[PDB]
Design a protein around this ligand. Structure first.
Ligand SMILES: Nc1ncnc2c1ncn2[C@@H]1O[C@H](COP(=O)(O)OP(=O)(O)NP(=O)(O)O)[C@@H](O)[C@H]1O
Ligand SMILES: [Mg+2]
Length: 737
């Protein structure tokens, strides 16, 4: 039994290695320590200083260097006793200060223990290297085990969700959030894998197979991750009342369409582009008019056309086969690629103007190329691009567009194609796997946590808006659960949210929506409306001292400065009607769907923001009906390196993600809640007349306490556990046998 076999890899890779002793004694020491910032500017960098003396009010300690300093006991960051180094739950620490928390995390990461609980959360730090704890044998071990019976692992929380589901006859949710490259996706895939195994394969296969299809089209190499998810997702894993997988459904959000037409240096476009160009038969290429990526504008601009340790051709085979599995007819497959192909060509169109001011097409090659694969009409396309008829009152007149404008329209078309296509694939897949008549589900949410970049635009507001809601959800959740526990033993975000989504008074989005109806409004009208309503008027809002295009929002994670550029266009997400027209006629069977199906070609008249808001509310509604599970995925550094855990990088995430807050709150009450028997077995020796093994654990606990003369205000007799305030258990742990 691996859990019992100290030689098992389970032990090796999931546990702190255990020696031959239980004995409290080993850990004996006289030294006390504190965590101090050896540089008060750089406050996340801490060093451990031994307390060489104390006053009634402060402590005096020596630094690394031998530099004595002093601190107020109240400002002190007491170091937990070494026995606590490596605990599986931060809820077990007595001193619950930030440096303390990072240290426990760090001690673990140094032994390659990437999973740690913090109360309700499962903290997962990216290892940036392989750790073989996701095997089938690894799976087998988590089966039916309680949180407390096994080591922290993603499989563990997935097991608990599954049992709870079966046992409470209640739907479940796993919310996996954090920074780009933190490993949300990786964990997400593990949760599914696990469920597929405990509860499962034909459907299973298709279910599994759906992923790769989505990652090809929705994932790309960015500077933060080689396989970044450019869309958020909610996976609903469906079960029948017997606890077997009955189906699945996928909800996608915020796909980054812009990446299609543009990519930052060293980044790539979505994977599919390269896989196609790489894995397409020499005879498929021809039919498709394809060359190397270098031959395409949409792919030859970033400098990067390949990912190390990645074969696009091998990957393409893998994508194609996945589609094969799920059920895309070859016919389908073709058009998909044809679309990918068409899109490529569209990007290759060079607009020229000088004949006038309005643009023209000297070379119809790329144009012809695109139209062909799309099955649309080149002359209609051509016109639709440079000479759209536009409603100007009563009259409908063809406008002759310049290059820029012409070029931007072409781009808009590309992005609609891509977005709609993505949508369609999602639909197609749900069709296959999805259940009308399902009994229970476990939904997995894999999306970014708060985003605070150099530049923050409309998308960051959206994501950060979702994030305030999820944080408020946690908070409420924590509240109820903390109350129950306390109860079982006889012992805001609204303002931000409103600023964003308020109706009356209007919040940011309502203002944006308002501005949206006016063909001639501008970024400047928009930002001015915003400041007019909120500058010095809304406590969560900040009008910048000098920038005229930005504004600040005080979020849960702190202030975020947004820039308004293009918001009006993003909100409306315009496409010339003639292009729709053009494409609505397409002779391609997949193409006609993207444009003829309202569920695909349209919103609801509603804006992008209104749609975002609505989908977030549905999401929350669903979540509200589940028993939730929280996973905080943490990136260790910004360099994609193993064995390199940077306190500043780390601390900042724990600050933003709700981990440290959860603890600060929890710290104020009775953080340590131990089982009577558990307490006694380790401390019996501290009092006179206590056998490790006592039938009356509670009485026994009182003896030690009393023997020790602990301050009764510091502890709390629960019906089954002893509750201890912060520091208490440490002191205790610090007592003589
Ligand atoms: N447990 C893990 N073991 C090994 N590698 C991992 C693990 N978690 C993540 N990784 C590695 O880190 C990379 C990024 O993980 P990933 O799950 O894709 O991050 P993410 O949070 O989904 N990023 P993003 O989609 O861009 O927001 C992976 O491709 C692996 O290189
Ligand atoms: Mg991801």
């Amino acid at each position: 039994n691996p859990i019992h076999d100290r030689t098992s890899d389970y032990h090796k890779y999931l546990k702190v290695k255990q020696g031959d002793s239980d004995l409290f004694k080993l850990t004996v020491s006289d030294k006390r320590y504190i965590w101090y910032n050896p540089d008060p500017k750089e406050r996340d960098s801490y060093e451990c200083g031994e307390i060489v003396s104390e006053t009634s009010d402060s402590f005096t300690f020596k630094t690394s260097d031998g530099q004595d300093r002093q601190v107020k006991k109240d400002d002190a960051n007491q170091r937990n006793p070494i026995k606590f180094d490596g605990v599986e739950d931060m809820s077990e620490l007595s001193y619950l200060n930030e440096p303390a928390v990072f240290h426990n995390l760090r001690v673990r990461y140094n032994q390659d223990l990437i999973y740690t609980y913090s109360g309700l959360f499962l903290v997962a730090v990216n290892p940036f290297k392989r750790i073989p704890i996701y095997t089938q044998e690894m799976v087998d071990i988590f089966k039916g085990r309680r949180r407390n019976e096994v080591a922290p692992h993603i499989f563990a929380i997935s097991d608990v969700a599954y049992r709870s589901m079966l046992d409470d006859r209640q739907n479940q949710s796993l919310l996996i959030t954090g920074e780009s490259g933190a490993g949300k996706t990786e964990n997400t895939k593990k949760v599914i894998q696990y469920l597929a195994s405990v509860a499962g394969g034909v459907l299973e296969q298709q279910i599994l197979q759906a992923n790769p299809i989505l990652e090809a089209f929705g994932n790309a190499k960015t500077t933060r991750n080689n396989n970044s998810s450019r869309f958020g997702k909610f996976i609903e894993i469906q079960f029948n009342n017997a606890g077997f997988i009955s189906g699945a459904s996928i909800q996608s959000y915020l796909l980054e369409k812009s990446r299609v037409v543009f990519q930052s240096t060293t980044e790539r476009n979505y994977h599919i582009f390269y896989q196609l160009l790489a894995g397409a038969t020499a005879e498929e290429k021809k039919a498709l008019h394809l060359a190397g990526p270098e031959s395409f504008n949409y792919l030859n601009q970033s400098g990067c056309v390949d990912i190390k340790g990645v074969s696009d051709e091998e990957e393409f085979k893998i994508t194609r086969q996945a589609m094969d599995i799920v059920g895309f007819s070859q016919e389908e497959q073709m058009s998909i690629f044809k679309i990918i192909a068409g899109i490529l060509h569209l990007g290759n169109i060079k607009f020229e103007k000088g004949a006038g001011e309005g643009a023209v097409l000297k070379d119809k090659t790329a144009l012809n190329a695109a139209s062909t694969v799309f099955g649309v009409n080149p002359s209609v396309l051509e016109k639709a691009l440079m000479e759209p008829r536009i409603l100007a009152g009563r009259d409908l007149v063809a406008q002759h567009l310049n290059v820029e404008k012409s070029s931007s329209s072409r781009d808009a078309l590309v992005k609609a194609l891509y977005g709609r296509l993505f949508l369609w694939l999602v639909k197609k897949i749900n069709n296959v796997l999805c259940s009308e008549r399902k009994a229970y589900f476990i939904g997995v949410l894999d999306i970014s946590g708060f985003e605070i970049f150099k530049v923050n635009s409309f998308e960051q507001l959206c994501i950060n808006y979702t994030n305030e809601k999820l944080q408020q959800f946690f908070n409420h959740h924590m509240f109820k659960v903390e109350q129950e526990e306390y109860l079982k033993e006889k012992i805001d975000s609204q303002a931000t949210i409103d600023l964003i989504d308020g109706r009356q008074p209007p919040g940011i989005l309502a203002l944006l929506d308002e501005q949206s109806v006016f063909p001639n409004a501008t970024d400047n009208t928009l930002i001015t409306k915003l400041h007019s309503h909120f500058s010095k008027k809304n406590a969560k809002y900040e009008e910048p001292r000098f920038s005229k295009t930005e504004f600040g929002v005080t979020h849960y994670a702190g202030q975020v400065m947004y820039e308004i550029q293009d918001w009006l266009e993003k909100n409306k997400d315009p496409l010339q009607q003639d292009l729709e027209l053009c494409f609505k006629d397409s002779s391609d069977n997949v193409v006609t769907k993207l444009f003829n199906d309202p569920n695909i070609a349209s919103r609801a008249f509603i804006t992008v923001a209104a749609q975002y808001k609505e989908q977030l509310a549905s999401l929350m509604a669903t979540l509200e009906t589940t028993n939730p599970h929280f996973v905080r995925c943490i990136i260790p550094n910004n360099k994609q390196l193993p064995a390199k855990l940077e306190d500043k990088v780390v601390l900042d995430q724990l600050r933003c993600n709700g981990v440290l807050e959860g603890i600060r709150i929890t710290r104020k009450g009775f953080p340590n809640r131990i089982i009577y028997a558990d307490f006694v077995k380790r401390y019996y020796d501290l009092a006179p007349n206590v056998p490790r093994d006592a039938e009356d654990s509670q009485k026994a606990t009182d003896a030690v306490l009393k023997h020790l003369n602990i301050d009764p205000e510091q502890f709390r007799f629960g019906i089954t556990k002893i509750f201890f305030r912060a520091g208490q258990l440490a002191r205790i742990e610090e007592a003589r046998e």
